[PDB]
Design a protein. Structure first.
Lengths: 333, 308, 308, 85
């Protein structure tokens, strides 16, 4: 659903200041060769060749590590999240956007992303990048840029008397559709989204139900960095498999449970399901080398185990006796 | 005559494209109303236009040479003629005043036309007395001079004695984006190339040079006439007495059918027949038909203070 | 001509900013009505204006030079010309009388215009007979002389013989804060800089010098004309016989459509067509159209005593 | 629309008269193209449970085996009746 909601006059100066702060000290850049882009990490290649270099140079710089979390290993993500929650003393807010790529306006697209790319890249490459942006208007970096712009707008609205550089220095971790911010702008974020024309969903941090971030649940971010898959999103749908019909059910289930072990080995109410899938569909599945040579293969802390159990129960609103009964039923099947 | 073939052979064309990326962002833009409600103010409209041109120039990635590439906003007075701006043969964008009404209220600043000059009197700012240089008339190709140093002037002196001149070409577009301020337009230009032209030879494409408009009607002295085009392919005419506030908009067809009548009584009867009952309309129509001349007085005016 | 470039090279500009903090508290202020009910009194309005300017000058932290920085309230008579106030090149604030009506009741003191002077007669206070110095007309830049000692006068004598003068520039704003007393305004000034000007050369910005207003209409002898702007972007005209009480306010458009008529009967018919039925209005309109001159008599007046 | 026409056409899948094969990513956009040209199109998503229909031939398991049979839907309901002269 395309939208053409231009922002107000005042917000334009805030957006320009945010873009300039994003530029930082990297005035000049050069495009990457086709071979280097191909070995990095059709239609994706032509934009990737420039966008990967732009991200790696500007968005992964010294003065842009405060907010651009997108682009780091999951261990790095967990470390950053724990550091941010320690800094904010467990006072953080979560942002959940609905169809951001389908809702970003033309003015935002042509005044944030296009401006940033043109300022980052060399003048001799202006025509190619502008043509690529025009083709885009009619991937990953766009969401991060939108999140950074919205964070800058919120910070500018919260403290209009501070210098833009100091305001932007407080930008918290942001990664695409998910991000973190101070809880003091919980109500003012909705007005900023309305001014830009975006829809924002915000939820106050609650230790009883855990914290939601990148479909990951932090059981107790104050002390431990233990983290698990989001139970709210996956439990209601994990019993149904959305793989293509051509794949046997056993191979898809095996890949799903292998990923779950790789990410959620010691999570209550999921380990039992994964083990029962491995016990039932496991022997009936095909050879694992066969599925490793098949395209659809990629189409999918012990100390606080008690606390993780209680946090999962709070997340799923299931009584402990009910949880034990469910665990017994799952294991005995 | 053979002069045509002579000139055609005398091409001397040197097209230049200095990576002048087309400003398609400025082109084909939906009109918008700046003010939320009521009506806008000259400052507000100017700020909106500046924002639009600034964001366009930022998106295209190029620079500009702002005058208090080339950009000018409400600088009709500051610029004696557009030829000085065009002689640089660079992209030029203007936010000028090319009204579709002979008089009335422009944005929030009332205006009137005395002689061929516009007695513009901004609500906030100095009153402007400047003409209009025929921007929005039919045609896309314009002829303009080119900047040349006095030394080059001396060099061409023998060459210009015969009647040779260096002429630049440009392409034109405007938008009229504000509905609340239709009298203002957003001119757009694109230079094409340069050639040498003989003074005493015609051109195929009927390229015109910007000229001062002649609003006065020789057939109706003391009156100013003007007509424009409408969204629904309608040709409306705006008329009013020179240096005076009143004006009226009417279809040129009805004005044509009225003009040839003989009796003012017949004129009034025909006006009644079409359902027009407003005296302010029929009386002005009759006044124009009879060509009544009145010596309008010059009286002091008391304006508002600007409310920023 | 080369005189333009000569003058431009002759800049001799010396801008001065003596920590003159902008009086933004005075600027962009919502209009207010001083009187609780009925109507205010000249003393009440003067007290309110004095309070406003005093609290503004206290907030800004600066001082003032009150005359019975620079501040003046209803001192149009006490000051022969505003140039004497402006020559100091210091911030100046005035509470003057720049009416939007030719005549009528000003605040609580009736007033009328004979010749180009205002026959102001305060309810409490001496009757004032002074002109108006064209304060609220279009434009923000003004030219005024500068104080110079007689010794400096002698020094410049050889220099002024050619036609050189020392001229100061200022920026302008007024507010008209009282709705019950619209005829009064709160002028605001800000000096900019000083330069040297040739007498026989023009200026780009059309800077004007304050001049006495010419209310009389040469086309309608014995009558005074005036017109102003309205909140809703309407251009209203106020007219009335000189040295006499009556006045009327009308849109300039209707007056324009009326003025060119030939028969008074047609004028009355058109007035009837617009729904205007008040004889006090139509009769005055007809009187102005026909330019009827009447020798108004001078009779003694009996005013009220001030009720403090 | 942004790719070169030659590269676009190089992806044309098998087509044979009234029957043909195409990528499933344009399942919904094919109807709009047919409407633009003025043709009527019938499209069905591939389902391994019910097999694949092509040239009145049914592929039992095209992922592994190439075994194929006559279309059962078209012929079973009419094989008992003979349409000979």
């Amino acid at each position: 659903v395309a939208n053409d909601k231009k922002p107000s006059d005042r917000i334009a100066k805030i957006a320009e200041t945010f873009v300039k702060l994003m530029n930082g000290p990297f005035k000049d850049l050069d495009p990457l060769s086709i071979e280097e882009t191909i070995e990095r990490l059709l239609f994706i290649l032509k934009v990737s060749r420039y966008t990967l270099a732009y991200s790696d140079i500007v968005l992964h710089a010294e003065h842009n590590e405060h907010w651009y979390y997108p682009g780091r290993n999951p261990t790095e993500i967990a470390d950053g999240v724990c550091e941010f929650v320690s800094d904010c003393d467990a006072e953080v807010i979560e942002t959940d956007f609905s169809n951001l790529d389908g809702r970003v306006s033309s003015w935002m697209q042509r005044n944030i992303a296009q401006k940033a790319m043109v300022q980052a890249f060399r003048p001799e490459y202006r025509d190619e990048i502008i043509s690529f942006m025009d083709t885009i208007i009619n991937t990953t970096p766009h969401n991060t840029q939108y999140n950074g712009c919205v964070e800058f707008t919120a910070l500018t609205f919260e403290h209009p008397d501070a210098e833009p550089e100091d305001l932007f220095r407080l930008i918290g971790p942001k990664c695409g559709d998910d991000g973190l911010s101070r809880a003091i702008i919980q109500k003012s974020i909705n007005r900023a989204a309305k001014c830009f024309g975006l829809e924002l969903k915000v939820e106050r941090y609650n230790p009883e139900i855990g914290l939601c971030f990148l479909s990951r649940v932090f059981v107790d971010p104050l002390a431990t960095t233990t983290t698990i898959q989001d139970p709210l999103r996956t439990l209601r749908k994990l019993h149904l498999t959305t793989r293509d019909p051509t794949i046997p059910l056993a191979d898809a289930a095996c890949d799903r449970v292998e990923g779950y072990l790789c990410t959620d080995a010691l999570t209550p109410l999921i380990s039992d399901y994964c083990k029962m899938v491995l016990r039932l569909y496991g022997p009936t599945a095909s050879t694992e080398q066969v599925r490793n040579q098949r395209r659809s293969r990629n189409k999918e802390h012990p100390q606080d185990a008690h606390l993780m159990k209680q946090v999962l129960i709070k997340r799923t609103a299931i009584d402990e006796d009910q949880v034990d009964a469910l665990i017994g039923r799952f294991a005995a099947m | 005559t053979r002069a045509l073939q002579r000139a055609v052979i005398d091409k001397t064309k040197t097209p230049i494209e200095t990576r002048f990326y087309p400003l398609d962002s400025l082109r084909t833009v939906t009109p918008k109303r700046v003010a939320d409600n009521g009506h806008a103010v000259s400052g507000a409209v100017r700020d909106a236009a500046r924002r639009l041109i600034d964001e366009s120039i930022t998106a295209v990635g190029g620079s500009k040479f702002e005058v208090n590439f080339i950009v000018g906003v409400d600088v009709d007075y500051y610029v004696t003629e557009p030829d000085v701006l065009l002689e640089h043969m660079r992209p030029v964008v203007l936010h000028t005043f090319n009204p579709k009404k002979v008089s009335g209220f422009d944005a929030d600043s009332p205006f009137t036309i005395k002689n061929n000059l516009v007695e513009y009197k901004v609500s906030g700012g100095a009153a402007w007395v400047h003409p209009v240089w025929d921007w929005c008339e039919a045609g896309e190709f314009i002829a303009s001079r080119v900047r040349t140093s006095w030394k080059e002037w001396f060099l061409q002196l023998p060459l210009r004695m015969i009647g040779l001149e260096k002429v630049g070409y440009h392409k034109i577009h405007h938008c009229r984006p504000w509905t609340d301020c239709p009298d203002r337009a957003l001119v757009y230009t694109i230079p094409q190339y340069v050639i040498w032209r003989f003074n005493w030879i015609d051109t195929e494409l009927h390229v015109r040079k910007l000229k001062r408009i002649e609003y006065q009607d020789e057939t109706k002295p003391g009156w100013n006439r003007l007509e424009y085009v409408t969204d629904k392919n309608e040709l409306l005419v705006s008329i009013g007495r020179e240096g005076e506030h009143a004006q009226i908009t009417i279809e040129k067809e009805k004005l044509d059918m009225l003009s040839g009548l003989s009796a003012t009584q017949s004129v009034n009867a025909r006006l009644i027949g079409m359902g027009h009952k407003d005296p302010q309309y029929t009386s002005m129509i009759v006044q124009y038909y009879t060509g009544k001349k009145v010596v309008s007085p010059i009286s002091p005016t008391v304006y508002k203070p600007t409310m920023p």
